[PDB]
């Protein structure tokens, strides 16, 4: 796709994902998904389809009651911007039951940690593709 725009967006997503980092079924990009340099070489569409699916997965979680429900996010939360950026990126690539309140703060932390790892993988993919493809 548009390697450069994807590279720039994925970089901003990495920044957003760490911006509120506190003091401390799931799509994961696996070895077999071909998001490593050799794999992107041969055929990159597999990787990009896996990244697209990961992005849609996170945007849906961030728009769910885990994040919109109590304890309410503060007005300074970057979850709003993260969500828009995840949508923004998924778009460049191809243009889930109720949670218990007492569990949401921990679920949000776990999802955001997992999101940090995912976005970093995507950022490396788009940077390599931009530089070599």
């Amino acid at each position: 796709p548009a390697w450069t725009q994807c590279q720039q967006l994925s970089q901003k997503l990495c920044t957003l994902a760490w911006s509120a980092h506190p003091l401390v079924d799931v799509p994961h990009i696996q070895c077999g998904d071909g998001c490593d340099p050799q794999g992107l070489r041969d055929n990159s569409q597999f990787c990009l389809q896996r990244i697209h699916q990961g992005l849609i997965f996170y945007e849906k979680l961030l728009g769910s009651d885990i994040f919109t429900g109590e304890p309410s996010l503060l007005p300074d939360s970057p979850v709003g911007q993260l969500h828009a950026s995840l949508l923004g990126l998924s778009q460049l690539l191809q243009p889930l039951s109720p949670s218990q309140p007492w569990q949401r703060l921990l679920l949000r932390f776990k999802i955001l940690r997992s999101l940090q790892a995912f976005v970093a993988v995507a950022a490396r993919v788009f940077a390599h593709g931009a530089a070599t493809l």
Partner: antibody, heavy 115, light 108 residues
Framework: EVQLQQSGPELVKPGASVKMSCKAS????????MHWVKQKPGQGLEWIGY????????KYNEKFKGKATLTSDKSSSTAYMELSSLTSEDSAVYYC????????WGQGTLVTVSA | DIVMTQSPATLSVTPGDRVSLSCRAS??????LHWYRQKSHESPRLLIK???QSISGIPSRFSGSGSGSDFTLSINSVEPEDVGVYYC?????????FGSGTKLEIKR
């Protein structure tokens, strides 16, 4: 400024249904869930359920499943509750409320079920 | 379902006095407990959230404490405008549930 404006009082026949609305302003509609709560005249409060407008996901109190249906219209930032097969037991004030911890409830809609 | 029990049902107090309202949960709810007051003809108004956290615009007279199953709302020096029914609420797990209320009456 935040407002949750509910629709007017309603006299409903037993067996009929009624749909009431809660128009939200002054905040991002999709950023909070919208709860509905029942309160019988001079009595306590019961939570009915909520809707999450972004995905239309709902969560009900088991006591109200099948009595209440929550929906939302993002285009008008309005949450709705429809109550089905009404009996005198459903006569009450019904409130809409944002997330509990943000302190905003609608003014209530009084439903009277009578022949 | 978690049952929230409040006591006393009614309280008659002299302004200036300190007041204590109790709320007990049938199961531990950590600090996911909110307090409201509902005055005649109004919707309930959040006073304290998460057991002890203050709410912008509410008098410093009000404070809450407790964690787990037993909670207390304290009014430092009661004022006339405090009259109304005070409810506690399980903000912890489904279904959310409210206590039966304590009606506060003022002596004059």
């Amino acid at each position: 400024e935040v407002q949750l404006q509910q629709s007017g009082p309603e006299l409903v026949k037993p067996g009929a249904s009624v749909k009431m609305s809660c128009k939200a302003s002054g905040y991002t509609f999709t950023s909070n869930v919208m709860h509905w709560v029942k309160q019988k005249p001079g009595q306590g409060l019961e939570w009915i359920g909520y809707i999450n407008p972004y995905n239309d996901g709902t969560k009900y109190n088991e006591k109200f499943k099948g009595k209440a249906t929550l929906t939302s219209d993002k285009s008008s930032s309005t949450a709705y509750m429809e109550l089905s097969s009404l009996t005198s037991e459903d006569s009450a004030v019904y409130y809409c409320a944002r997330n509990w911890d943000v302190a905003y409830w609608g003014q209530g809609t009084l439903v009277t079920v009578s022949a | 379902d978690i049952v929230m029990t409040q006591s006393p049902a009614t309280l008659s107090v002299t302004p200036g006095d300190r007041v204590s309202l109790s709320c007990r949960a049938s199961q531990s709810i950590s600090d996911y407990l909110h307090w409201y007051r509902q005055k005649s003809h109004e919707s309930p108004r959040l006073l304290i959230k998460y057991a002890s956290q203050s709410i912008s615009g509410i008098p410093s007279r009000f404070s809450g404490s407790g964690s787990g199953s037993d909670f207390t709302l304290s009014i430092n020096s009661v004022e006339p405008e405090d009259v109304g029914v005070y409810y506690c609420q399980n903000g912890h797990s489904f279904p959310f549930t409210f206590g039966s209320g304590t009606k506060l009456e003022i002596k004059r």
